[PDB]
Design a protein around this nucleic acid. Structure first.
Ligand SMILES: [Zn+2]
Lengths: 221, 71, 129, 56, 25, 83, 101, 217, 132
RNA sequence: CAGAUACCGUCGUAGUUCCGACCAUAAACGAUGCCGACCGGCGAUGCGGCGGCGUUAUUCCCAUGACCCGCCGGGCAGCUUCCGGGAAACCAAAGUCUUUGGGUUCCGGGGGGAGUAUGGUUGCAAAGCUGAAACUUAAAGGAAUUUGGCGAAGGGCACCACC
RNA sequence: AGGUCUCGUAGACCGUGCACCAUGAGCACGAAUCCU
């Protein structure tokens, strides 16, 4: 129940200067501190475990076993994350998966199918991610349909917050880590796709360092 | 698809026919030799009367004898 | 040898757009290539494109901008109807809010929404988004 | 400055497996283990069997 | 038994079967 | 971006590159934010106005970033025309 | 798998080269595959040169040299320890071994 | 940054550049370096146009003075030619020095005692400093580098074309960049030369130190 | 063999870095210093530490050392790189200027300079090592 | 050597060489079909052509050959790269592939039975092409990682090893 | 007229292939989370 911010970003977040996490995503700062997201996203950041599988490295005297835990965390109105940690026991492997998933979290965008009435509910276009041999598609769906997929990307898109999707996977789907990372990579690059809805040139607002350099030279060495 | 031409459908149909013929399930289900060698003759059930009761053992990992019958 | 000049031109401009350059040397010339690039210009995807006059074959130099995702060719030329085009934009366009399908029409080389509102159809050419 | 707990015996099964819980600093050789680490070995009489505890 | 000597043994068996077939016509 | 009512539905609009006009996500950490000071014509001193540009990570990883910044200064008139 | 960029030899557009024979063995090996070694030797070795020059009638008599070319099959080359196996990362070193004396 | 009459060279900076041998480059060529070269002469040395070096140097000075905190500028040197030069540059312009043994994971490992958060990075040779460019890629860190005609322009943003082999040119342009940064900040004069001595940034081996020990008292 | 441990070497290096004017080359004297100014739990460790201190003195009295920084041995480096000569080595009466870069300089901004001269080009163009 | 019609050593018939008539088989392998467009850099090599300070065929000129400096076209290759691809080894093609369509020929649907039996065709013959089925099986495989064992190599140690 | 001209001698590539050497019965391999 304490915090010493070792980085400049942590001090800026703690000193009530940076408003949301959206501008941190906008300038693409590397978030090397876990509890920045804890400070921004509160109790709505619900987590659950995907699979705890064992990996074994054999030695001369028997074989040594380690457990790696795939854990996805995310908020149901946008941001979703995913983290893999391999350690000795299971509980601190779960905690390492929590901290590494809270480190690696990205925002998503939501669009419309056909008609633009109300809140966005589905993915804006056909987006596709790939890791390993696993190829995952995310195709927009009409309103009130629901996610149709395997249960693991289904729960990943529900914790992402999208209500409607169409999916089509290919490859060794049974490897849950590769499938989860492929779905996370597919949903992460929605801000890497250029659309005519935002063809206008973005005004270059300054970095928070450019306005809070006085505060940081007061509070740091 | 490999041969993509606007006036090419007989070649695609014949090649698909040959590669469909060169299969396992389709070759079994569309040749008469399998049903000639089928004891049931392509039927779900069959009747019969008992010759004798014999006994055969299991494979290498499982150690038991399974008591089949000769009909 | 060469079969479609539009396929080579679209592949060349797609490769030069992915590498991030700004000028593309389209070596063939055709009426369908000029009309296709004119449609892409009218829908706000490219800028000033050239036609270099020569007594052999013209060359086209385009002014690229960071606006094109992928432009491609559907070979061979598939004829469509008005009801048949919906499946083509279902399985070819990435979304319904953007993207275009250019198809040959007796009214000229012209996209799919305009061919829909003019109650017509014809052979397909390609797509861009 | 450091401690560790070892529990050995039949832990939820038939084969005897040992769990070792190390953290901190801990020496093992020479004389200073006489008057820096304190060793206590106890036996626990469970319903299933016996259990051994080493804390240092 | 590697593949080449298996092929040679199969060739010898084929020769013997061909000879007994042509002598048993 | 916009609905039938006219409200803005995206959380934020992402940054667009100055040179290649591409899009910058939250995972490409190689993207920079160059601030270039504007110097007054007569005194040769800093005034307080700057001209900022964004360079994407791919064109900076490839090595073509410096001529992109040079062309940006050519278009903005910071660097000389004859050069 | 593919161990080397080439196939352990030095043909790129030929398909066939004339065969040669090993020295320790009698193995038929292709010419561009065999590990050649053109050794430069002389008549006497290190210390007999003083005795030869003492017994040689001609003053300042220059000593002759023996030039032979040695061709090795790769098994006979490795068994004679003229070439040794290398690591996967350091296999791609076409520089010759350094000479000092 | 030199399109006007106030940010050009008049008569003597060209004398310093010709005396230090900055115009004499190398014998090979990088594929992005034909912009800043004139043509090959005899004995295979590529000569560098002086206004291109001037404009890139003044653009680097503008980039340095544009940020507020001078301690956020990080100077890096690894070779022996530019050790004291970046120390004097950090003493003059307020930068922060790493000269010799840039440890890996300096900008990424956030628990080290030597972990630093800069905002602008400058080096002396991206061939000799191929290690801090990797961490400069891993964080949001633009780089300004002092490149020769043979140096690869990978992971760089502002490239100053020069000669970085001899220590004379390296010391001269570190002093030169120091004076233009101090001019654009607004401390020293523009028509009166600040040139109290330009040999303070030059590197010298201790053999000539013991030579002048033998020569003088 | 007699190879010193990281503890002995580290303690000797830090005791040279902290204290320098209270030691010497005599082993028993700085053995007594190392006994007085530090806490050492043994006699043999104290003797090993004092021996490595004496070896460090014999190293230091020759020349510079790359591991130990001493304030009395410091200020000498900035003494050597603070003073400057009278000649700046940049303002001479002759500058070696090739005719090609002279023609380059004539195109640049100038028609004539007061400190430049023109030499002759070489008769033969060889500039690379023979490698084929 | 226990056995040795095997490794080894000495002889030695067909064959190895040339001509005339056959068969059409190889790890015939770059284990990578042909044509065509695009997509980075660098040092070199072989050919043909173009341009240029200089040295030589003994001293002047020109052209030819021989060096040096560069360019163009075709080709055998090489180094490097976070273009990109792949399961990876790796590949400037094995890239431009879910953002899936340049033209076109052949060819594979888990492993074994099996390149087997019959039929046809070809061949003096040996064999070549075409080519199944019943039955049996839950794995057979490709790349890479860590102690493992080598009558594998390179360095050290031990009187529970030797001298 | 003078008398062994001068700075150190790693002043080793001299060494190719080295007898006989087979076999191994098997039952046991276990796959993990939270603070009150
Ligand atoms: Zn041999």
């Amino acid at each position: 129940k304490e915090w010493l911010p070792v980085t400049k970003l942590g001090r800026l977040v703690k000193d009530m200067k940076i408003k949301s996490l959206e501008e941190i995503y906008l300038f693409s700062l590397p978030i090397k501190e876990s509890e920045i997201i804890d400070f921004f996203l509160g109790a709505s950041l619900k987590d659950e475990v995907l699979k705890i599988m064992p990996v074994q490295k054999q030695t001369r005297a028997g074989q040594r076993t380690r457990f790696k835990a795939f854990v996805a965390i995310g908020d149901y109105n946008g941001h979703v994350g995913l983290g893999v940690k391999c350690s000795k026991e299971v509980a601190t492997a779960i905690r390492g998966a929590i901290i590494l998933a809270k480190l690696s979290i990205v925002p998503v965008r939501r669009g419309y199918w056909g008609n633009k009435i109300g809140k966005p509910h589905t993915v804006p276009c056909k987006v596709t991610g790939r890791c390993g041999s696993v190829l995952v598609r995310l195709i927009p769906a009409p309103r009130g349909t629901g996610i149709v997929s395997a249960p693991v990307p289904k729960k990943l898109l529900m914790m992402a917050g999208i209500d409607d999707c169409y999916t089509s996977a290919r490859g060794c789907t049974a490897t849950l880590g590769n499938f989860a990372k492929a779905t996370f990579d597919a949903i992460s690059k929605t801000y890497s796709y250029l659309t005519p809805d935002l063809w206008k040139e973005t005004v270059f607002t300054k970095s928070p360092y450019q306005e809070f350099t006085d505060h940081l030279v007061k509070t740091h060495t | 698809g490999k041969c993509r031409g606007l006036r090419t459908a007989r070649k695609l149909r014949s090649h698909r026919r040959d590669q469909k013929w060169h299969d396992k399930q389709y070759k079994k289900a569309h040749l008469g030799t399998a049903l000639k060698a089928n004891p049931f003759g392509g039927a779900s059930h069959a009747k019969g009367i008992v010759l004798e009761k014999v006994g055969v053992e299991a494979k290498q990992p499982n150690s038991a004898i399974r008591k089949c019958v000769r009909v | 040898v060469r079969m479609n000049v539009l396929a080579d031109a679209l592949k060349s401009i797609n490769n030069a757009e992915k590498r991030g350059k700004r000028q593309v040397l389209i070596r063939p010339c055709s009426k369908v290539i000029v009309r296709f690039l004119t449609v892409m210009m009218k829908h706000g995807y490219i800028g000033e494109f050239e036609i270099i006059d020569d007594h052999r074959a013209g060359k086209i130099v385009v002014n690229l901008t960071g606006r094109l995702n992928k432009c491609g060719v559907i070979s061979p030329r598939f004829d469509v109807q008005l009801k048949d085009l919906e499946k083509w934009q279902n399985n070819l366009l990435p979304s319904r809010q953007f993207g275009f399908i250019v198809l040959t029409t007796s009214a000229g080389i012209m996209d799919h929404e305009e061919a829909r509102r003019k109650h017509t159809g014809g052979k397909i050419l390609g797509f861009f988004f | 400055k450091g401690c560790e707990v070892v529990v050995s015996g039949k832990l939820r099964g038939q084969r005897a497996k040992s769990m070792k819980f190390v953290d901190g600093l801990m020496i093992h050789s020479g004389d200073p283990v006489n008057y820096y680490v304190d060793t206590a070995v106890r036996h626990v009489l469970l319903r299933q069997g016996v259990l051994g505890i080493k804390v240092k | 038994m590697r593949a080449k000597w298996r092929k040679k043994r199969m060739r010898r068996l084929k020769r013997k079967r061909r000879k007994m077939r042509q002598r048993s016509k | 971006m916009q609905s039938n009512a006219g409200e803005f539905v995206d959380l934020y609009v992402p940054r667009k590159c100055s040179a290649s006009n591409r899009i910058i996500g939250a995972k490409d950490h190689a993207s920079i934010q160059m601030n270039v000071a504007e110097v007054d014509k007569v005194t040769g001193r800093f005034n307080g106005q700057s001209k900022t540009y964004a360079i994407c990570g791919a064109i900076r990883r490839m090595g073509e970033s410096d001529d992109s910044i040079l062309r940006l200064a050519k278009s903005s008139g910071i660097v000389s025309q004859n050069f | 798998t593919k161990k080397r960029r080439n196939n352990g030899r030095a043909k790129k557009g030929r398909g066939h080269v004339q065969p040669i024979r090993c020295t320790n063995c009698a193995c038929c090996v292709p010419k561009d595959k065999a590990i050649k070694k053109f050794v430069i030797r002389n008549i006497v070795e290190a210390a007999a040169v003083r005795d030869i020059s003492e017994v040689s009638v001609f003053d300042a008599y220059v000593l002759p040299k023996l030039y032979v070319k040695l061709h090795y099959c790769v098994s006979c080359a490795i068994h004679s320890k003229v070439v040794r196996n290398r690591s996967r990362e350091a296999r791609k070193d076409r520089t010759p071994p350094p000479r000092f004396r | 940054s030199g399109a006007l009459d106030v940010l050009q060279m008049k008569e003597e900076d060209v004398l310093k550049f010709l005396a230090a041998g900055t115009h004499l480059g190398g014998t090979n060529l990088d594929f992005q370096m034909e912009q800043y070269i004139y043509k090959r002469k005899s004995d295979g040395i590529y000569i560098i146009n002086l206004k291109r070096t001037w404009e890139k140097l003044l653009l680097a000075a503008r980039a340095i003075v544009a940020i507020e905190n001078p301690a956020d500028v990080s100077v890096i040197s690894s070779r022996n030619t530019g050790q004291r030069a970046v120390l004097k540059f950090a003493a003059a312009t307020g930068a922060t020095p790493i000269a010799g043994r840039f440890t890996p994971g300096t900008f990424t490992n956030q628990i080290q005692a030597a972990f630093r958060e800069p905002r602008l990075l400058v080096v002396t040779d991206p061939r000799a400093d191929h290690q801090p460019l990797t961490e400069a890629s891993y964080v949001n860190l633009p780089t300004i580098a002092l490149c020769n005609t043979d140096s690869p322009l990978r992971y760089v943003d502002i490239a100053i074309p020069c000669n970085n082999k001899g220590a004379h040119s390296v010391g001269l342009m570190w002093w030169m960049l120091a004076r233009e940064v101090l001019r654009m900040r607004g401390t020293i004069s523009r028509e009166h030369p600040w040139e109290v001595m330009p040999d303070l940034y030059f590197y010298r081996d201790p053999e000539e130190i013991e030579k002048e020990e033998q020569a003088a008292a | 063999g007699r190879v010193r441990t990281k503890t002995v070497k580290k303690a000797a290096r830090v005791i040279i870095e902290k204290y320098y004017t209270r030691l010497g080359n005599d082993f028993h004297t700085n053995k007594r210093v190392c006994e007085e100014i530090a806490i050492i739990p043994s006699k043999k460790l104290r003797n090993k530490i004092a021996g490595y201190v004496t070896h460090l003195m014999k190293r230091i009295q020759r020349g510079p050392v790359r591991g130990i920084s001493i304030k009395l041995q410091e200020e000498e480096r900035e003494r050597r790189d603070n003073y400057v000569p009278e000649v700046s080595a940049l303002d001479q009466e002759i500058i070696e200027v090739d005719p090609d870069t002279k023609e380059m300089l004539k195109l640049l901004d100038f028609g004539s300079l007061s400190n430049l001269q023109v030499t002759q080009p070489t008769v033969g163009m060889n500039f690379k090592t023979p490698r084929g």
